[PDB]
């Protein structure tokens, strides 16, 4: 079972992944791969990629110890984005979305 905290946790990550924001997460429903998206230093510029498969996975593995775990990897996915990509790309205002939905979601946590 997860705790409390996590079974909330877990909704915002099926939220995440859900049709009415997929005009904007599709971006980070998989790892960036690196090669076949021709950005090839990815690896060099982000040392802990994170995407929510991954986050979603580490779920399903009772991976997270507390809900401030799995905020960590999220924030960590958004982050990953901001620090890699100029920020008027059209991925940042994607990631910028999709950070308004998990922050408000978090912080209305009981
Ligand atoms: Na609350």
Partial sequence: ????????????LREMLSKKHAAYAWPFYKPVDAE???LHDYH??????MDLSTVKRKM???????AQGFAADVRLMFSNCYKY???????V?????????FEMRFAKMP
């Fill in 93 to 101: 205002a994607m990631a910028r979305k999709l950070q308004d939905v």
């Fill in 1 to 12: 079972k997860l705790s409390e905290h996590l079974r909330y946790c877990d909704s915002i």
């Fill in 36 to 38: 076949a998206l021709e």
């Fill in 44 to 49: 060099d510029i982000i040392k802990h990629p």
């Fill in 85 to 91: 990509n100029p920020p008027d790309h059209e991925v």
């Fill in 60 to 66: 399903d593995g009772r991976e997270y110890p507390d």
